[PDB]
Design a binder for this molecule. Sequence first.
Ligand SMILES: Nc1ncnc2[nH]cnc12
Lengths: 195, 187
Amino acid sequence: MFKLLLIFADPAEAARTLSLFPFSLNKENFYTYHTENVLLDVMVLKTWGYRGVVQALSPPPSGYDLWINAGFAGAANPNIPLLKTYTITSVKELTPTTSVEEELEVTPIPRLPLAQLTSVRSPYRDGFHEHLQLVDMEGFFIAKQASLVACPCSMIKVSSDYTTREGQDFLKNNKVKLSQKLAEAIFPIYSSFID
Amino acid sequence: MFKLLLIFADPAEAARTLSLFPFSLNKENFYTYHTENVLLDVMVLKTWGYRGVVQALSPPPSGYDLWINAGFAGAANPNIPLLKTYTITSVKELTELEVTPIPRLPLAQLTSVRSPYRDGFHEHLQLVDMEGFFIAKQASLVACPCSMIKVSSDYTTREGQDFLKNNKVKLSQKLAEAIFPIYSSFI
Ligand SMILES: Nc1ncnc2[nH]cnc12
């Protein structure tokens, strides 16, 4: 029996995927669905408050066969069109006050185009950048927690906004469309693990 | 822009497919969704069988590039397992028309009847429904290709509907999981 964990940063990202299957809330306060040989669970990191906390995935969930982090990401290069779904090859956490970085490889999803991801704490609205592609908040954290349970981790990121002040309105106004692109990319993955 | 019409005979059969996209309700039982490249419309009949087809699809809508009739079907041969999604190659009325198969689905032939068929397996039948023949006839009027997705929902023996009633969610979800990739085939 194949056990797949989906991880979304927030409810908006998760919404359309949660519509795809008849999930139920379990007694542990997260969403679950199973059929045939597949268990499909969903966890949402930040449902409350102004920020996510480390205990959202600490200790990391044990026992799954694959984690997929699906979410929105800002485009920091104008050559990335919006509303486009990518899979991630590597994710780096960047600390802007020191320029110190860490970086982990992640497992690409078949048939999605490849991109690099940088995770940063604060929303990225500085502008465009020579050496950034997609930018999110939680990707590195999730990949690093996955390493603690030796579970492979893949990422699906949809381009949600250009990383400028003016560009944030597009994210504000297109959350349903963006969440739908995530759902459409997740389905063929789920389907490939039916035995 | 590709234009797809999906037709379901009742809301329970349609329910999980309608959960797949953030459809807008244009009018009673008529749902619409689009991206730039694909228009996806869903019609749910207001009653079953030939009467419901006539009410909803006469006149037949023009302008679509494909019609898909998705629904529950009875299995009239014990060699057909239940909870299995098939695509249809031909359809006839028990009392014939080619149908366009959806790729990567098991193949079956369909017979459309005007009353719930419970006569057992004593005929060379495969899957049995109430709407498909009549929907294919309407699609022909507008020279539109027609495909059908039929999930085996009961055996055509007495009280066989109990399996369908117990498995409504799973059956409706099987239809949704066959429909979701078709939408993606046009992007
Ligand atoms: N047994 C049956 N007869 C006719 N139409 C059906 N649709 C589903 N089951 C059926």
